[PDB]
Amino acid sequence: GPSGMILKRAYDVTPQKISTDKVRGVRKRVLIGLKDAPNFVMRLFTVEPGGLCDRASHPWEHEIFVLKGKLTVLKEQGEETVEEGFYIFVEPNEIHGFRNDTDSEVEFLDLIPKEGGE
Amino acid sequence: MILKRAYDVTPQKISTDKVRGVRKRVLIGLKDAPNFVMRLFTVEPGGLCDRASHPWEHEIFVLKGKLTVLKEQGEETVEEGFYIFVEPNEIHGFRNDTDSEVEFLDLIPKEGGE
Ligand SMILES: [Cu+2]
Ligand SMILES: [Cu+2]
């Protein structure tokens, strides 16, 4: 594939609204997307106050790192709170979701294998 | 599901012919990862990862500080909030010319180990 290196301010990407049956109040920046990624993609999610990614599962993993704020993680059985500086590994097919129960935006990095899209 | 404070993962001091003044935390490693691994590097003041290359990419996010990125020729300094995509085989390295620790997240495909 191509050579080189990209160095870019993540906020130079405009956060795009995500709106699905399960997702409301969330925006996403694609940092390293399908047009460039050899194996896996890097996105930066912003969860607005009250925003929700309701419980779901899918046949690929997540690797997440929380950049800003206090995030509620929805699990099969209950919920748990994380904050800036936490990482999360979600196994393939594990039930998960996210909610922002605070007044300010939450941001996290989210990487998935590229077979799961961007 | 694993939910953990990255700080609580024990850092490893890296010391090689190319690397000095660097610590590495393996957050999501080979025992867990289906496809790619997540590490968190801390570069001490004056720390250096000298130019190298390998047949896998990096996907990096700068968490703290001003990171000097070494390129095949020359260098570029970036700061917290930058991401870095290093294509496979591209020469790269890192240095911290500042007086405080620099941290960055670094993900590689599992073929690169952890
Ligand atoms: Cu998911
Ligand atoms: Cu490297």
CA distances from A45 to A1, A17, A109, A118, B49 (A): 28, 10, 6, 12, 30
* End-to-end Cα separation, chain A, in angstroms: 19
Contacts for B105 with CB less than 8 Å, ≥ 6 apart: A65, A109, B38, B39, B40, B60, B61, B63
Indicate the Cα dihedral angle A39, A41, A42, A47, nearest 10°: -150
How far is the centre of ligand 1, averaged over its atoms, from the C-alpha of A12 (Å)? 25
How far is the centre of ligand 2, averaged over its atoms, from the C-alpha of B93 (Å)? 7
Is B81 part of the contact surface with chain A (CB cutoff 8 Å)?
A: yes
Q: For B58-93, b where at least 16 C-beta lie within 10 A, e where not — what string?
A: bbbbbbebebbbbbeeeeeebebebbbbbbbebebb
Chain CA centroid to CA A64, Å = 6
Is B92 part of the contact surface with chain A (CB cutoff 8 Å)?
A: yes
Fill in the DSSP letter of residue A104. S
Q: Is B50 within 8 Å of B69 (Cβ atoms)?
A: no
Q: How far apart are CA B85 and CA A8, in angstroms?
A: 9
Q: How far apart are CA B50 and CA B38, in angstroms?
A: 21
Q: Is A5 within 8 Å of B71 (Cβ atoms)?
A: yes
Asked if B27 lies within 8 A of A87 by C-beta distance, the reply is yes
Asked if B83 lies within 8 A of A8 by C-beta distance, the reply is yes
Q: How is residue A98 written in tokens?
A: 């996210």
Q: Which residue has the tokens 């790269």?
A: B92
Sign of the Cα pseudo-torsion (A25, B103, B57, B38, in order): negative
Question: Nearest-CA neighbor of A112 among B66, B59, B31, B41?
Answer: B59
| Gyration radius of chain B's alpha carbons | 13
Q: How is residue A87 written in tokens?
A: 């990482």
How far is the centre of ligand 2, averaged over its atoms, from the C-alpha of B53 (Å)? 6
HEC assignment per residue over chain B: CEEEEHHHCCCEEECCCCEEEEEEEEEECCCCCCCEEEEEEEEEEEEEEEEECCCCCEEEEEEECEEEEECCCCEEEEECCEEEEECCCCCEEEECCCCCCEEEEEEEEHHHCC
Contacts for A5 with CB less than 8 Å, ≥ 6 apart: B69, B71, B84, B85, B86, B87, B90, B92
Q: How many CB pairs under 8 A join A and B?
A: 119
Element (H, E) at A63: strand A62-68
Fill in the DSSP letter of residue A114. G
Is B62 part of the contact surface with chain A (CB cutoff 8 Å)?
A: no
Which residue from A7, A60, A89 is facing B69, i.e. has the nearest CB? Answer: A7
Q: How far apart are CA A57 and CA A46, in angstroms?
A: 20
Q: How far apart are CA B3 and CA B6, in angstroms?
A: 9
Asked if B36 lies within 8 A of A63 by C-beta distance, the reply is yes
Report the structure determination method.
Answer: X-ray
Is B5 part of the contact surface with chain A (CB cutoff 8 Å)?
A: yes
* Domains, chain B, ordered by start: 12-66+91-97 (2.60.120.10)
Contacts for A96 with CB less than 8 Å, ≥ 6 apart: A55, A56, A57, A62, A73, A74, A75, A90, B1
Q: How is residue B66 written in tokens?
A: 């001003």
This PDB structure is determined at a resolution in Å of: 1.1
Is B75 part of the contact surface with chain A (CB cutoff 8 Å)?
A: no
Q: Chain A contacts of B84, Cβ < 8 Å?
A: 5-7
**How many residues does the structure list for chain B?**
114
Question: Nearest-CA neighbor of A109 among A48, A67, A60?
Answer: A67
Q: Give the distance from residue B49's alpha carbon to the nearest chain A alpha carbon, in angstroms.
A: 16
Question: Nearest-CA neighbor of A100 among A24, A47, A27?
Answer: A47
